[PDB]
């Protein structure tokens, strides 16, 4: 999963 947010950034 925090990959999948972290690309934001
Ligand atoms: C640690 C998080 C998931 C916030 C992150 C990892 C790598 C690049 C950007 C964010
Ligand atoms: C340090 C960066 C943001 C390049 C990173 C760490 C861990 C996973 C992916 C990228």
Same mark, same amino acid.
């Given at each position: !999963? %925090? %990959? #999948? !947010? #972290?690309? %934001? !950034?």
């Amino acid at each position: !999963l %925090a %990959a #999948a !947010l #972290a690309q %934001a !950034l």
